[PDB]
């Protein structure tokens, strides 16, 4: 339950304002993650459609572009940067590229799904 662990560790409440509000990763919302999660959905559909134990070349290039997207999103929004650094999601992308199998990308997708699900839960 690494996902729940990191979400609850980064879970925080707006005590400074004096009004109750749960803050995840210093202000992260699903709207911030929308572009990158849609990109991951694109890669997931691409890998599901293909029948191959190892990832294809197009998948690898799309994952490199996903790493670039992670960097750009980290630059644009501090909340996404906090989420990515604490969740080590880009490092897991690098690990997936190292492994180069369909199953490891399926497990990475499972991990990201757990991350976003628990983030929505604790809000």
């Amino acid at each position: 339950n690494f996902a729940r662990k990191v979400v609850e560790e980064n879970k925080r409440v707006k005590d400074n304002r004096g009004r109750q509000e749960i803050v995840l990763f210093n202000g992260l919302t699903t709207s911030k993650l929308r572009n990158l999660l849609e990109l991951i959905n694109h890669v997931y559909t691409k890998v599901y459609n293909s029948d191959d134990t190892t990832l294809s070349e197009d998948v690898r290039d799309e994952l490199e572009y996903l790493k670039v997207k992670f960097a750009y999103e980290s630059g644009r929004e501090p909340a996404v940067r906090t989420f990515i650094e604490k969740t080590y999601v880009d490092k897991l992308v690098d690990v997936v590229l190292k492994k180069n199998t369909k199953k490891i990308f399926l497990d990475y997708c499972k991990y990201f799904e757990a991350l976003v699900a628990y983030a929505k839960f604790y809000r």
């Binding site: 699903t30 709207s31 993650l33 929308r34 999660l37 849609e38 991951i40 959905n41 694109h42 997931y44 559909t45 599901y48 459609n49 997708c109 990201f112 799904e113 976003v116 699900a117």
Partner: protein, 214 residues
């Protein structure tokens, strides 16, 4: 002899098509309305029940509906003969069986090219009449380039009524093309065009060469 006439063709979406359903996917989006998908392929689908319901409703409205209708069995005799009836003691089989329309292989290839997603996320809102505040909403749709392979079976129960039945089917299809398929069609979604590849009697000695629906 039991004659079954097969109508196979393409259902080109001319605008975003949103046939809602209980959806599941990776990194489930903020959308509360995801399209229906064929789970084995995860591609969007057109359920045959949607096509049959829309066609039957349009054809029944065209023929004219009995005032104070409480059931679909009170429609015109032509509608019950074509689409089937469930009335007590007067059950009529459905001559028209409308299969599910799967996402086409051609559109799948054309979207694998261009690096395009088969679906899209339309962002809408609703300006309130009182506070004049926009409430953002997100609807999943199928992009206008997509097409669907559609397969319909007509059952020849009575030989002499076949031409009238196909006239009614042509009327239903013509209404449906001008109307929308299942979605928020009054706001531009779900526009459709049928491109009939073939109409061949798969079973029976009956011939449907002269028979056309569009």
């Amino acid at each position: 002899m039991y004659s079954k006439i097969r109508i196979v063709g393409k259902i080109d979406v001319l605008t975003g098509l949103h046939i809602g359903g209980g959806g599941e996917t990776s990194m489930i989006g903020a959308i509360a309305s995801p399209v229906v998908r064929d789970p084995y392929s995860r591609l969007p689908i057109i359920p045959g029940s949607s096509i049959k319901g829309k066609m039957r409703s349009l054809l029944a409205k065209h023929i004219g509906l009995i005032p104070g209708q409480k059931m679909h069995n009170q429609d015109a005799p032509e509608i019950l003969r074509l689409f089937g009836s469930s009335q007590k003691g007067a059950i009529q089989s459905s001559r028209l069986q409308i299969s599910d329309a799967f996402f086409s292989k051609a559109s799948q290839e054309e979207f694998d090219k261009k690096d395009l997603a088969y679906t899209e996320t339309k962002f809408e809102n609703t300006i309130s009449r009182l506070t004049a505040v926009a409430n953002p909403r997100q609807i999943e749709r199928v992009t206008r380039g997509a097409s669907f392979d559609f397969h319909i079976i007509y059952n020849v129960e009575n030989i002499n009524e076949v031409m009238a039945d196909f006239e009614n089917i042509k009327t239903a299809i013509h209404l449906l093309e001008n109307d929308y398929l299942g979605g928020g069609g009054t706001r531009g979604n779900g526009r459709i065009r049928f491109v009939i590849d073939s109409i061949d009697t798969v079973v029976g000695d009956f011939d449907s060469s002269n028979l056309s629906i569009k």
